[PDB]
Design a binder for this molecule. Structure first.
Ligand SMILES: *c1ncc(Cl)c(C(=O)O)n1
Ligand SMILES: [Zn+2]
Length: 195
């Protein structure tokens, strides 16, 4: 089984947004619109904006899940490598096997799917606060793209789904992720390679 990655704004006009962080050597998280790709350091804050055209119903949730991008690896569950899953970096909520965490949200729930065995993290969809036009979720990625026995240099996609209270699909967006030591440099390199 492979989760859909089809972009779907749905009834509420759901889509993601990203900050403009640049590509300086000091940057820890940066998004490339040209590549639709987030570059980030291990376990560092990744702000992801949620934008809607109209407010979805109370009980709407936002789920994140990783899959492998490449055709020949899409059926394999994305998980932390044998090193990082045994790290003592628990936050009290995320299972140690999960690549994607939500930072600083006590209502985050982590799912180990009983059928597909895939991991995901889900939070309530909060409306924007006063003085803001969007809401932001802070994600952390807990293994490097290069980790042996884990992602093993294989690119991943994060799929963000807007769901109703039963888990039915309301909206979908996605982006590639590279977890790496030098996200600014790697973004510059990959944007050059594309050009
Ligand atoms: C995971 N958790 C803790 C530590 Cl100290 C390490 C490491 O070997 O750097 N990994
Ligand atoms: Zn790892």
């Amino acid at each position: 089984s492979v989760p859909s990655q089809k972009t779907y704004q749905g009834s509420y006009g759901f889509r993601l947004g990203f900050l403009h962080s640049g590509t300086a050597k000091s940057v820890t998280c940066t998004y490339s619109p040209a590549l639709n790709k987030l570059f980030c350091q291990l376990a560092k804050t990744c702000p992801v904006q949620l934008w809607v055209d109209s407010t979805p119903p109370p009980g709407t949730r936002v789920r994140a899940m990783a899959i492998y991008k490449q055709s020949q690896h899409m059926t394999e569950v994305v998980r932390r490598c044998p090193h990082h899953e045994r790290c003592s970096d628990s936050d009290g909520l995320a299972p140690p096997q999960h690549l994607i965490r939500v930072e600083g949200n006590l209502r985050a729930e982590y799912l180990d799917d009983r059928n597909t065995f895939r991991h995901s993290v889900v939070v309530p969809c909060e409306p924007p606060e006063v003085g803001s036009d969007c809401t932001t979720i802070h994600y952390n990625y807990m293994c490097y793209s290069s980790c042996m026995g884990g992602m093993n240099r294989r690119p991943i996609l994060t799929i963000i789904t807007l769901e109703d209270s039963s888990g039915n699909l309301l909206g979908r967006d996605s982006f590639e992720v590279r977890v790496c030591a030098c996200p600014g440099r790697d973004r510059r390199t990959e944007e050059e390679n594309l050009r």
